[PDB]
Design a protein around this ligand. Structure first.
Ligand SMILES: O=C(O)CCCC[C@@H]1SC[C@@H]2NC(=O)N[C@@H]21
Ligand SMILES: O=C(O)CCCC[C@@H]1SC[C@@H]2NC(=O)N[C@@H]21
Lengths: 128, 118
């Protein structure tokens, strides 16, 4: 891959790329030639659980839009929660590549079922 | 909760009239399809690929609205929890985010869906 040659998510086709959000979480995504997305999410967000473990990620990328899902359970740590992201690609003016997303985090607390929401921006990691 | 659903195929319907049929593996991995019928939306009537994960009382899944027939240039992801009510099965109480790019740029809309198991 190249951050220079990125047109939209069709450019990820048959690639393995690493993205880091503003909380320091990292996802490694394998995008097949059909826009199928699989890989791993490592949550490093301060004051959240299930940090520094790989969780299965699955989704779909097409044109300028992408959606992916993680359940916070891997048979290691279980945070009784699940997160989904939906977003769009943006080319930065410096030649970088970002996925701007909205996440929903569902969990069962003491008061039972709740849903939190926010924004993550993932930045493509060059790794040359 | 969704630990029951392991190795099963289930149909769910939300209040907007959409139907998703999900296949849950022994690992909590989810595939299947989604048929949108929400008033005011595109890509109504045809199946779209669905992927995500389910474990215990929570679930997250994603649909890109392109299937090689109709392309709405958009993607939706849902995260939700099992609510037990007064029947067999559960409802999924969800938050959805819909991403698309148009004339005011990349936009992400949000709402609630409640899916009902048949
Ligand atoms: O605390 C939990 O229930 C499990 C980890 C959740 C981390 C959330 S997902 C939304 C946001 N984006 C991140 O990278 N981490 C937090
Ligand atoms: O209009 C589009 O861009 C494609 C279809 C979007 C359907 C939305 S996804 C959120 C909401 N819940 C549904 O069941 N359908 C609508």
């Amino acid at each position: 891959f190249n951050a220079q040659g990125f047109t939209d998510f069709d450019s990820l086709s048959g690639t393995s790329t690493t993205w880091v959000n503003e909380l320091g979480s990292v996802m490694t995504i394998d995008v097949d030639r059909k826009g199928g997305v699989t890989g791993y999410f490592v949550n490093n967000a301060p004051g959240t659980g299930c940090r520094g473990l790989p969780y299965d990620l699955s989704g779909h990328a097409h044109g300028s839009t992408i959606a992916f899902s993680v359940v916070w359970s891997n048979g290691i740590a279980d945070c009784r929660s699940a997160t989904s992201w939906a977003g769009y690609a943006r080319k930065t003016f410096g030649g970088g590549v970002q996925i701007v997303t909205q996440w929903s985090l569902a969990f069962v607390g003491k008061a039972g079922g709740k849903i939190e929401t926010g924004q993550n921006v993932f930045t493509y990691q060059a790794y040359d």
